[PDB]
Amino acid sequence: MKRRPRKWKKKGRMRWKWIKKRIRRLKRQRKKERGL
Amino acid sequence: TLLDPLANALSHITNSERVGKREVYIKPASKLIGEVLRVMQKYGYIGEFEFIDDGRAGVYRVQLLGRINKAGAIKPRFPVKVSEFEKWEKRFLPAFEFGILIVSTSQGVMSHKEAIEKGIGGRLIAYVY
Amino acid sequence: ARMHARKRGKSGSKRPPRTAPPIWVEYTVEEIENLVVKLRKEGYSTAMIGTILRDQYGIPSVKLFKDPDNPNRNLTITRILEKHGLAPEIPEDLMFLIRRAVNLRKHLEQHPKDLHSMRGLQLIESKIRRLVKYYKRKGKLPKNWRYDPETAKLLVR
Amino acid sequence: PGKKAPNGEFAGRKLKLKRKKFRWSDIRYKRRVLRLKEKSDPLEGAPQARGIVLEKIAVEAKQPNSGMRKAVRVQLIKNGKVVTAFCPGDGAIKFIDEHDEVIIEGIGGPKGGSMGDIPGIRYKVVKVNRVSLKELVKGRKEKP
RNA sequence: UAACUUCGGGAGAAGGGGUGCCUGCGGGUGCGUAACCCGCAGGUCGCAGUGACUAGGGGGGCCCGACUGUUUAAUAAAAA
RNA sequence: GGUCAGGUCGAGCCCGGGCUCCGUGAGGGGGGAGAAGUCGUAACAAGGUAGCCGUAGGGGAACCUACGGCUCGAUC
RNA sequence: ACGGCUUUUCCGGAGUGUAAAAAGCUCCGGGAAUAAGGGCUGGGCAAGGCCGGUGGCAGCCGCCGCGGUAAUACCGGCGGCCCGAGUGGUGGCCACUAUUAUUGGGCCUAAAGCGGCCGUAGCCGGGCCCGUAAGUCCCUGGCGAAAUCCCACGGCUCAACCGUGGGGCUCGCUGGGGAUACUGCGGGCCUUGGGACCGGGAGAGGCCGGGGGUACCCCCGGGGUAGGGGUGAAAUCCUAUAAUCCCGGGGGGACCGCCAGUGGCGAAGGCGCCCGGCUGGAACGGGUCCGACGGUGAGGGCCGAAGGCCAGGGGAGCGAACCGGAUUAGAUACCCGGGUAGUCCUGGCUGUAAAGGAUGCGGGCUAGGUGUCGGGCGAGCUUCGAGCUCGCCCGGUGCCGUAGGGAAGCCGUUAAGCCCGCCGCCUGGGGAGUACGGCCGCAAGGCUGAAACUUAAAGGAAUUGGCGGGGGAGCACUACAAGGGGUGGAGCGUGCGGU
RNA sequence: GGUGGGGUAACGGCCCACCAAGCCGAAGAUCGGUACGGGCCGUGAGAGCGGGAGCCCGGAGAUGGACACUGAGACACGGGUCC
């Protein structure tokens, strides 16, 4: 994944590590649903 | 690496003038540098200058009289006609006929004023005001 | 700065401005040529010949003496050697680079895990290719000449 | 960090390519060239549109403002798309009934979008039954 | 010449054109105008030229078992 | 100018393969707006276990743990 | 208000005008008679601190922002300010915008330098001499229709409009003559940049083989009894089948303690026990050799912490998952005992980090001071040591700081100053590094990468205050420590909440 | 691309018969999106950005295609044939 260092700042936001993990989970779910 | 001895020499002169130096050394030397120095001395922007041989390109020793506000080479060397000098004057000088645009023409290198007087064009190689 | 290491080392030779040979040189141009030829027969490279002449015989440089056969040029070790027909077939610096490149390949084949030495070999080969391109442009070597380690083994041998 | 390049006399091709490449980072230029607005514009690039009123609704003013803004749902005759049009005036809403023919016009806002404290509404009613809404609300004309 | 795919396959996927006889040339291996095989041009007949004989119908979804293989000789060959 | 034969340009129709765009379609996924909702308190002070980036595995949810790294971390 | 005047324009007539009409033009008659609206009024922006209606409702609002019972901001009246036969609303283009930056933007902390290096096309390229004139400059012929554009004069009353002359525009093409300063091209001679080589030294730079260091874990033999371990406190756990602890031996697997440093080396990632072999790079001293061979580099190639995956070994200590004991309202954690993968070796794949100096690379120049590493030079000491001290030069590595730069923090010859080059990247915050498409990988994942929609802000530096389960300095019987008497338990007096 | 020819009012792979492997392309071929091109117009101090319907010049079309007759000139908006 590309780097957006502005996202690492925690002011009014969830930790980027866990946002990234959740995004990967969503992508994997979509890939399973498509059947790839 | 070294690409433009003329630009190096002019920037060195400008920095020395800003700091308030009285003498400067220019290396490497070349005929173009010599002619530019000749024009500047003719117009009174510098003092006495001399050539020093060292088995290499050579060196120039120049006396500064604290009369230069800014000198710099022009890159790329834009060609210019006799009737297309006002735009360059506006671009590179504060007021009309304030400084000089050193231009390399087919009859040697001379100030844009001399070029206009002779009715010939050339390529802008430097400026000083 | 250096081509690869990228650090500014200003160590070198400081040649004084001269226009003619010193008055205290004890050898003539012909004797200097004879010394160059005999040293080349002994087997020293051009740089070694120049160093030996500077040190033992007190000859600051052959470049100071005018060329007796061409008034438009000064003398040189390579020019003297080619006058006598002893000039190297391949340029000396390129040959040295190829020799140490083949030696490094010999070492690497036995030590495949020496990645730093492999990078050194890569840099040496890049230098070799640069010199080959320059010599091709100047016509010193044939246009069909190419650098290949397999042939370089025989060339060094 | 470093003099902006290229600056050579024979580098016009590279300069032109650099400018062309980096002109795409400009949103306005990209939108204009790709004609993105016309691809999704309900009005298809028209200053005004015509439609039929389907129902009358209200929306809430944004924080910290508080109030009911009365708008209508209009189906365009051009392509049948349904949009929301705000009714300007103190009592403009009562002058509009269902199945009425209205003319809607863009609402002055940033980037030609929403205005004030009522996002989601991009159009306002100008004429109802071929009569000016401003005239009707001000009382100089009677609704036909 | 498709979806898919375990990249092996699916596949002869699907779908389209030609095929007889006669008169002359060119080509491969060959000593050869021996023998076998491969193209080219022209003329010509029939409704039909793999003319008889020989000789696949095809495609798209779902369930089950991965496949080849074995089973109640005498009503069950299957998902067992 | 009628008939037969041959050669050309070729509309229209049918079939197969492409490319571009457009509409919809049960259900599902996340996204943004919304008002005073339920659970907990993850971050900002040493934010009460310093925070954060790679990877990996766990947890209702903010999150937790392990290896390597930075200070955009306080006190001594 | 009174007394006068004109008829532009309107109305009715006569000529002229027109192919015929009409419009225009000259004249006669009546007469101020026939003729002003649109937005705005809180700032940006000229204009009201006036009166009535509504009291977070109606509404206004391009943006800021007004309206909740004294509204200069909404509706209406009265005033006023802008333009005026116009004045307002909506969409589009240009300037605004140096927010597309050749002129002329940015990338340490706000958007952004590829994790790092090697190198192909392209771009930019040391000094001198000679030759050609392709680029370049000057002069002169043939062209680039007219209308449109600018200037002067003349005709419609001036003007708009048209005519007569001059110029400009079509971004330029082509036939010839002249110059060679620069670039291009062919030739010649140089050493300054960069390479090659020799000499004495420096270094945790790499790979291979051999030899060690304690420490930790397990097992056996001897001594010795009851606890050991662990926490804020406990518990789980080990212990009579002899634990913990001490001593004599055997086995194994990882790591090289202090010295050690703002120290050294490497392109980066990274690299620290000792002796031996192989090997890369750099600094220094070089009147040594080649003679521009150079810089950056789209595509492309190699390297690349930890973690993960494939196959085979190994597994001491730690320890994701997991199983138990604690704390808590809960604790899927912090805390405590065990523990699988992993961490280690031999062949591969993955190509990812706050891979950070958040700073791309080569070159010239712009005050100093003071630490330290390697080399060289000079001087003085020397226990004559590869020893010590001082000064100077080059190359590394830190701190302060002048000129100057910057929003500031701070940078300042190791620039984030000025100048000459090359590539890469950014164009408000989300949506989103997501959806779809394509390549690579066994997989995990990696690279490339938008729109619809939403939003007025997001973001950076720094100042004052207030806070901290931050650090200090003090102070207080509406704090404590040491004390004396009490309230809270009962009846009642009195004052509250509720009914 | 060549050799030899046909056809044309004319040269030409325009077409034909044979001989070869040539031709284009990251300086962006091919494919896809959009569009009549220019003189010019709108804006800006200029560099530049944007448009290129009305007037002039040139090009195409006559409901969507395909064909021929007469004529110097058409495969022809108010001529002809077929879908």
UniProtKB/Swiss-Prot annotation, chain A:
GO terms for cellular component: ribonucleoprotein complex; ribosome. The gene is rpl41e. The keyword Ribonucleoprotein applies. Belongs to the eukaryotic ribosomal protein eS32 family. Part of the small ribosomal subunit. Disulfide bonds: none annotated. Initially thought to be part of the large ribosomal subunit. Crystal structures show eS32/eL41 to be a small ribosomal subunit forming a bridge at the interface of the 2 subunits. It comes from the Archaea. It comes from Pyrococcus furiosus (strain ATCC 43587 / DSM 3638 / JCM 8422 / Vc1). Keywords: Ribonucleoprotein, Ribosomal protein. This is Small ribosomal subunit protein eS32.
From Swiss-Prot, chain B:
One of its GO terms (cellular component) is ribosome. One of the primary rRNA binding proteins, it binds directly to 16S rRNA central domain where it helps coordinate assembly of the platform of the 30S subunit. Gene3D superfamilies: 3.30.1370.30, 3.30.1490.10. The gene is rps8. The lineage of its organism: Archaea, Methanobacteriati, Methanobacteriota, Thermococci, Thermococcales. Pfam families: Ribosomal_S8. Belongs to the universal ribosomal protein uS8 family. This is Small ribosomal subunit protein uS8. Keywords: Ribonucleoprotein, Ribosomal protein, RNA-binding, rRNA-binding. It comes from Pyrococcus furiosus (strain ATCC 43587 / DSM 3638 / JCM 8422 / Vc1).
Swiss-Prot record, chain C:
Disulfide bonds: none annotated. It holds the Pfam family Ribosomal_S13_N. One of its GO terms (biological process) is translation. It comes from Pyrococcus furiosus (strain ATCC 43587 / DSM 3638 / JCM 8422 / Vc1). Gene3D superfamilies: 4.10.860.130, S15/NS1, RNA-binding (1.10.287.10). NCBIfam families: PRK08561.1 (NF006331). GO terms for cellular component: cytosolic small ribosomal subunit. One of its GO terms (molecular function) is small ribosomal subunit rRNA binding. SUPFAM superfamilies: S15/NS1 RNA-binding domain. It comes from the Archaea. Residues 1-20 are annotated as: Disordered. Residues 1-17 have a biased composition (Basic residues). Part of the 30S ribosomal subunit. Keywords: Ribonucleoprotein, Ribosomal protein. This is Small ribosomal subunit protein uS15. The keyword Ribonucleoprotein applies. Belongs to the universal ribosomal protein uS15 family. CDD domains: Ribosomal_S15p_S13e.
Curated annotation (Swiss-Prot), chain D:
One of its GO terms (biological process) is translation. GO terms for molecular function: rRNA binding; structural constituent of ribosome. GO terms for cellular component: small ribosomal subunit. Pfam families: Ribosom_S12_S23. Keywords: Ribonucleoprotein, Ribosomal protein, RNA-binding, rRNA-binding. The keyword RNA-binding applies. The keyword rRNA-binding applies. It comes from the Archaea. Signal peptide: none annotated. Part of the 30S ribosomal subunit. With S4 and S5 plays an important role in translational accuracy. Located at the interface of the 30S and 50S subunits. Belongs to the universal ribosomal protein uS12 family. PANTHER family: 30S RIBOSOMAL PROTEIN S12 FAMILY MEMBER. This is Small ribosomal subunit protein uS12. It comes from Pyrococcus furiosus (strain ATCC 43587 / DSM 3638 / JCM 8422 / Vc1). The gene is rps12.
